[PDB]
Amino acid sequence: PILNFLYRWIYDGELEDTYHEFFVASDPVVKTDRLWHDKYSLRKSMIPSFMTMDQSRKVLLIGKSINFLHQVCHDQTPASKAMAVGKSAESPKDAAELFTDLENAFQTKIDAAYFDTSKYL
Amino acid sequence: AAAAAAAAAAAAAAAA
Amino acid sequence: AAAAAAAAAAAAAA
Amino acid sequence: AAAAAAAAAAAAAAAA
Amino acid sequence: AAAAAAAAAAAAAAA
Amino acid sequence: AAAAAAAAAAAAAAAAA
Amino acid sequence: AAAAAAAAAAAAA
Amino acid sequence: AAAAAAAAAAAAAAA
Amino acid sequence: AAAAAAAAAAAAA
Amino acid sequence: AAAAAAAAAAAAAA
Amino acid sequence: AAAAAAAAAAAAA
Amino acid sequence: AAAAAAAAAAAAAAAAAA
Amino acid sequence: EDDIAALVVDNGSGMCKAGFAGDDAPRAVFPSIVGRPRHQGVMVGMGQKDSYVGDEAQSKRGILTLKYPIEHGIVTNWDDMEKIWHHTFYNELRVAPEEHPVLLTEAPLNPKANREKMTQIMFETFNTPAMYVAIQAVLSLYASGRTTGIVMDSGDGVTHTVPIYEGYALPHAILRLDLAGRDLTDYLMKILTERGYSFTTTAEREIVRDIKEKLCYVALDFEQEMATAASSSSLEKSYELPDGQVITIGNERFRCPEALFQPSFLGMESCGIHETTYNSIMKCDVDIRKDLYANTVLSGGTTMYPGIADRMQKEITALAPSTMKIKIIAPPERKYSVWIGGSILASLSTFQQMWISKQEYDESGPSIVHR
Amino acid sequence: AAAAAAAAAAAAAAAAAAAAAAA
Hints:
This is part of a larger assembly, with 14 protein chains of nine kinds.
Chain F: H1 2-16
Chain G: H1 2-12
Chain N: H1 2-22
PDB class: cell cycle
Keywords: gamma-Tubulin Ring Complex, microtubule nucleation, cell cycle
Entry title: Structure of the vertebrate gamma-Tubulin Ring Complex
């Protein structure tokens, strides 16, 4: 469930929290116009121990930029529909894979999404 | 059986 | 009309 | 019955 | 057998 | 046999044509 | 057109 | 049967 | 089978 | 078998 | 010659 | 499921031409 | 994969068509242009930039300097041809061509040294794992069914007449004719002033290339269509525009496809489109000539016209013998028919031993393109 | 059910191959 919060919020960004199961509680503050205000706090008291501190600030940085391209009068997922192919690939990879949680290769292709969504923005 | 194949040869000749 | 008659000839062939 | 239709269908395919 | 011999004879006479 | 007898009669008619 | 249509239907049977 | 005739008509448009 | 007859019409076009 | 027999009579007649 | 041999194969069949 | 069937129909169409 | 994880780049005769395989329509098409602002200073309206390429260069033309990498259908400069390949891979699609094999096209009559130049570009700068050089002629014929027949290349550039027999093209029959769609749009301009309508900018001259494929139509029997125009039939149309310029057509409705068969309207003595079709088949082997008449395929941007299939049928029968079964196979789309053939070739059941990879390029150089 | 539809896809692929063979 923890990484199922992640890659959809990287790929589409449709908020699906009820009790903030992730350490990024999406929209706990009332909606305001963007003055570079931090609505997505990372909440130290619920950090997974396979996610280090520079990666918890990293997934905030992709999650803050993915919401800024929704209200740019574009509903286009960043620069291609290849972000939607990626989620499908990941879900089959999870299906094929025995029980292991990837964290050294999981942090690699989110660089390739973070540098992707920043240049398109 | 044989008469049904005889009518199939007649419809093939009508198209030709 | 010709394709409807050829489909009946194909159904008669099968 | 069916053997007479098989010999006639192979000759109709050769005629076409 | 005899009907199939005449069925192929009518086709060979058509060509 | 009987199919070859009718084929031989058909062969005489085809050779006449 | 008609010759290939008669051959494809005969090949399926 | 019309779906097999439509695919045969598309093959008739090819050759 | 229904999509295969439409794929032949798409390949001919 | 019958299709090859009709080809033998066609080559015999023509 | 060969027409009688092919007719002999039809009689053998 | 449906998009994989359309890709399989394009695969069998090219395999028929091979 | 390569059903979807392979790129189909159709480098046309004036437009680049990029997009993933498996589709029946290309992703991003735009005219192949580059633009250089020779000096710096202030840049207004768009971003401060030392080189506008692609779609940011089409909005500024009297602001920029223009350069076509593809003239006469053949690449004339290889620096700006790679710059559009840099623009299509990273800006209009934004995917790295380092894991995805890349399917690119070429001219049927380009030299091998040009064909070795494009293999050196894709391997070093873009680092593709595998690629394949394919002619534009075999892709349009493969989209029309089997790989035998002749295709009528008439794009924005130079007309090619390439007869292909079961995947292999003929060496000494690729005829080069200087008839182009850009000549017909220039022909439409020199008979629009006779109506009285002129131009003042280049933007008004650009929509004539759109009207050439939109408003102008093919009539079967052009010869009575001018005879009925001589008796004043209803064939004059006047299209309306937002600004004050009103571009009309008179007898130029049917004459810009008539300039294909009659090059005297273009002012030259050269052969017609049906003649260079007939001259190509008249030097083939005599047994495979019948297989070429029944598989005539139209392709390109000049051939974009309704009712052109029966017009090409009635024009070729006067030169070909009357015992041949001739069929003009006209697809619904034909600018993009080369691209759909490159995607169905990409989704082939077996393409894995035909790959030109990085390993064979390191062991034999760019001469592995000889295949 | 679903396996019978996949086996029918292979039977329809052989029928599409014979149609392209006659054409």
